[PDB]
């Protein structure tokens, strides 16, 4: 009946404790053996390794490699699972959501907070949840973690130790899995194929992400643009503004918004940015700063890199960023 | 019996909806009137305004002004309440925790997610919780929000809309308030005066905070040091490392850690950083990067600014950052 491809990339799920600390050492065949994963029963699992990478530290070039491999596999597989490091899982899931347009199959990313060989490892549970969801007659890019299925472009890693490490940010979970029971939280009907798969791996990697902090000077904006960076993401305040008083930050940004996309997201985790609610937000908007609305940091960053691969025109970037491609952002 | 000082600074709690959006318009007398706050019954509340500031957008100079005003008030008051904007509440609470050593009285910061004049405003509830805790025979810097009392140097704003907007990060709450009932979560005995109050407002404001993202180049480190910044905070990965492969970020940091403190915190909210667990973390540590351990971003940033006001020696900064002054960091 079904054919699944499991793609290994390294990560904690591929790691073992050594004298040098945790080290990515396992190929996908060893992961599946050590996590006691069934390779058959109404399906056949095939496996493969993305060579010379470790998704403990994913590089954007790896996104292009993974996107090309996943896109080729769509022909030959009913479902695709990617095992990946947790720290950038959400970035890969988000970038794949923009690089693979209208996947006609489930692409499910997972990892583990614990190596397989550590006591109470989450790796077997998460691989099994990913396999169960990849066998569903659905399409899109998802993350399987701690029995949840989440839209990939809505996931963030919220903690560094706890097993419930991934959350859907400002968006419902897709589903919850209890064994052979899949409970759809958004209707299965909303994840059906709709148009033909397209591969688009264009991107500009020089996006810099700053936390907005009290006293942060406009000198930092001069510095990153002199370092030749092409987009700026600000982890800003809920009011969505920047100071005019005792500060050149807003005035130095207003000078460069005609030529450089400056995106306002939040340092806070939940509920997004609304630059209209406060006078300070409206002042920021009137400088040509682009609101990230309800997007994750991971979606904002990957989307802008992808957007800048297409155009240097800031109005076109503004339109791309506010286009809802795959439910990464509210309409 | 008791004397309390309520200090107004602006913020959402001082704001009203205008045609220009929310605007900070209310002095503390109007806040207390509009939130129907009792000014007596076993206490007397006096009030005052920090002039020519709006804590919607706090500036570090305002920290020095507030610290000096609060420190003077310790003589004449049993308790001190500061009403403040929510977006930088946690930064002011953390910086006051370093600038006012051994306060011999409760200093309680609060604000509101809603203006007083909006339906279902949290402002009255939060002011009342702050007053109840400021009447306790305790000492320290606390935040009152949504019936919780939290250690100031452990608070972060976690969301932009929800009323339960502040959390104690990697540390228990101090107390929970149900009316005239205060339930201590950490024993009241642990917040007693211990040595004489000292004021220390030295700080260096040029700290820049970067999110670690895939492909972020060492060119950004050259840029911020050429802009004359004196400390770098990295919102890094749970594994606590930075790439050597297809990257000069770690190698460019290793060049400047002898002269510039580079602090590793997390982009994730909960559970802190452990640079020993992974080989990639140990490689980062061996470059002279300073771990923030379990500290909030708000404590890390304010502590480093305060640390850099005292010394330019990176070993002395490393020792200051890992000194547990007021339970901002694990020992």
Residue numbers in the entry:
A (entry chain A), B (entry chain A): 1 to 331
What does the publication say?
The hyperthermophilic L-ASNase from Thermococcus sibiricus (TsAI) was previously shown to exhibit high activity and thermostability and is promising for biotechnology. L-ASNase exerts its anticancer activity by hydrolyzing L-asparagine (L-Asn) in the bloodstream to L-aspartic acid and ammonia. The subunit of TsAI consists of two α/β domains: an N-terminal large domain (residues 1–184, consisting of twelve mixed β-sheets and four α-helices) and a C-terminal small domain (residues 207–331, consisting of three β-sheets and five α-helices) connected by an interdomain linker (residues 185–206). In the N-terminal domain, the active site pocket of TsAI includes residuesthat are highly conserved among all types of L-ASNases: Y22, S55, T56, T86, D87, K157, and T12, which initiates the reaction.
The crystal structure of TsAI was solved at 1.9 Å. The asymmetric unit contained one copy of the protein. Crystal contact analysis showed that TsAI is a dimer in crystal as in solution. In the TsAI structure, T56 forms a water-mediated hydrogen bond with S15. The side chain of D54 forms a hydrogen bond network with G11, S55, and T56. The position of this loop is additionally fixed by the interaction of the side chain S55 with T9 and G85. The network of hydrogen bonds formed between D54 and G11, S55, and T56, along with the interaction of the side chain of S55 with T9 and G85, was shown to restrict loop motion in the wild-type enzyme. Thus, the higher rigidity of the loop M51-L57 is significant for maintaining increased thermostability of the native thermo-ASNase TsAI. In the wild-type enzyme, adaptive mutations stabilized the loop by a network of H-bonds and replaced the highly thermolabile glutamine residue with threonine to ensure proper function at elevated temperatures. Structural superposition of TsAI with TkA, PhA, PfA, EcAI, and EcAII (RMSD between TsAI and these structures are 0.5 Å, 0.6 Å, 0.5 Å, 1.5 Å, and 1.5 Å, respectively) revealed high conservation of the active site architecture and similarity in overall topology of non-catalytic regions, regardless of type, origin (taxonomy), and degree of sequence identity.
